[PDB]
Amino acid sequence: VNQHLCGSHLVEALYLVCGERGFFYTPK
Amino acid sequence: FVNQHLCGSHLVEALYLVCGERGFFYTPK
Amino acid sequence: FVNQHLCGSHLVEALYLVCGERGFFYTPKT
Amino acid sequence: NQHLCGSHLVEALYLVCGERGFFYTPKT
Amino acid sequence: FVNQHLCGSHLVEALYLVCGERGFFYTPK
Amino acid sequence: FVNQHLCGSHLVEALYLVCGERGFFYTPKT
Amino acid sequence: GIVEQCCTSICSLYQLENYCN
Amino acid sequence: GIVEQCCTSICSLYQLENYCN
Amino acid sequence: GIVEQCCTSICSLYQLENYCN
Amino acid sequence: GIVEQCCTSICSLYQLENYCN
Amino acid sequence: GIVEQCCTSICSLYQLENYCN
Amino acid sequence: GIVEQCCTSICSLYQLENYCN
Ligand SMILES: Cc1cccc(O)c1
Ligand SMILES: Cc1cccc(O)c1
Ligand SMILES: Cc1cccc(O)c1
Numbered sequence: 634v635n636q637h638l639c640g641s642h643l644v645e646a647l648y649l650v651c652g653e654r655g656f657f658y659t660p661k
Numbered sequence: 662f663v664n665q666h667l668c669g670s671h672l673v674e675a676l677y678l679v680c681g682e683r684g685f686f687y688t689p690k
Numbered sequence: 691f692v693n694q695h696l697c698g699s700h701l702v703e704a705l706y707l708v709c710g711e712r713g714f715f716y717t718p719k720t
Numbered sequence: 721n722q723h724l725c726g727s728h729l730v731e732a733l734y735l736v737c738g739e740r741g742f743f744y745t746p747k748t
Numbered sequence: 749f750v751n752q753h754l755c756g757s758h759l760v761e762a763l764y765l766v767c768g769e770r771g772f773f774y775t776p777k
Numbered sequence: 778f779v780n781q782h783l784c785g786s787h788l789v790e791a792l793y794l795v796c797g798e799r800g801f802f803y804t805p806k807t
Numbered sequence: 808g809i810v811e812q813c814c815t816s817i818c819s820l821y822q823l824e825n826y827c828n
Numbered sequence: 829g830i831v832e833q834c835c836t837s838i839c840s841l842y843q844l845e846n847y848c849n
Numbered sequence: 850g851i852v853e854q855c856c857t858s859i860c861s862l863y864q865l866e867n868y869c870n
Numbered sequence: 871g872i873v874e875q876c877c878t879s880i881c882s883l884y885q886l887e888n889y890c891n
Numbered sequence: 892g893i894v895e896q897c898c899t900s901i902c903s904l905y906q907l908e909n910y911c912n
Numbered sequence: 913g914i915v916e917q918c919c920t921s922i923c924s925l926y927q928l929e930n931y932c933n
């Protein structure tokens with residue numbers, strides 16, 4: 634659950650960091 | 662274009678929730 | 691406490707998404 | 721846009737309303 | 749610590765909302 | 778205007794991330 | 808609706824309080 | 829409550845749908 | 850892509866599900 | 871600072887107002 | 892200021908880092 | 913995975929940049 638909440642922030646961070654090229658996300 | 666950046670921010674959270682354990686590929690272009 | 695408060699923040703975003711046009715009710719305690 | 725704005729609205733409500741909670745009904 | 753980062757993220761949104769035109773300062777340490 | 782309000786909302790999250798430990802000031806006026 | 812009332816024009820925190828139950 | 833259910837364990841979206849109108 | 854479909858009009862979760870892995 | 875005050879126990883919006891400019 | 896510079900067109904994170912103290 | 917690397921310990925922006933396309 635904490636990791637699920639963290640993941641939510643992670644993907645936003647990835648979004649901002651990666652910009653135009655986008656990104657790949659998976660919690661493996 | 663700023664509106665598309667703003668939309669993208671919400672899209673990726675929607676994807677995160679919908680796609681769950683599978684994860685997702687995000688490509689603007 | 692904090693993470694309950696933080697967690698509810700994410701719940702309301704999720705409900706907004708899930709419920710779309712239908713809308714929803716949020717009452718934390720109960 | 722309105723759709724995106726409502727997402728910020730519900731977060732504002734969550735925060736303003738505290739333990740009272742709130743009803744979100746986008747056509748009432 | 750990660751929890752702290754997560755809390756600060758919510759804090760700045762709340763400050764944005766509450767402070768309005770005045771704006772705010774976020775200085776964690 | 779609400780479109781500026783909404784953009785600002787995202788801006789401060791971006792600032793939070795990039796600034797980290799250092800923090801930031803946010804004043805929409807100037 | 809709240810979306811029409813608060814997304815077209817900016818709502819004060821007092822106006823948002825109306826929608827709390 | 830929704831907090832008691834979904835902040836302790838992870839709810840599915842179908843479970844979250846129970847809180848829709 | 851997703852920006853074409855879902856930023857110009859409101860996609861459902863089922864539509865968004867198309868872009869999952 | 872804000873972190874010690876508000877990330878240990880929850881702050882009201884009026885306590886968060888202490889960090890407005 | 893930051894609103895006029897970054898809400899009209901997209902600012903990178905590198906550019907935004909100039910607003911850190 | 914990214915969750916184990918960046919939620920148990922903190923990741924830098926540079927580490928996150930590995931996940932860009
Ligand atoms: C606080 C807030 C958020 C979004 C729209 C509004 O009118 C007000
Ligand atoms: C915050 C959140 C979102 C989705 C499911 C959950 O159990 C919790
Ligand atoms: C849920 C969501 C977010 C962003 C765009 C959409 O079409 C739908």
Ligand SMILES: Cc1cccc(O)c1
Pocket residue numbers: 735755758759762875876877879880881882
């Ligand atoms: C509104 C809010 C966010 C994060 C921490 C707090 O104490 C309060």
Ligand SMILES: Cc1cccc(O)c1
Pocket residue numbers: 649663784787788791897898900901902903
């Ligand atoms: C990251 C971000 C948010 C909002 C506007 C911008 O130009 C950039």
Ligand SMILES: Cc1cccc(O)c1
Pocket residue numbers: 639642643646750794917918919921922923924
């Ligand atoms: C930016 C960010 C968000 C969440 C977890 C991290 O390690 C880093």
Ligand SMILES: [Zn+2]
Pocket residue numbers: 667670671724728783786787
């Ligand atoms: Zn937004």
Ligand SMILES: [Zn+2]
Pocket residue numbers: 638642696699700754757758
């Ligand atoms: Zn969070």
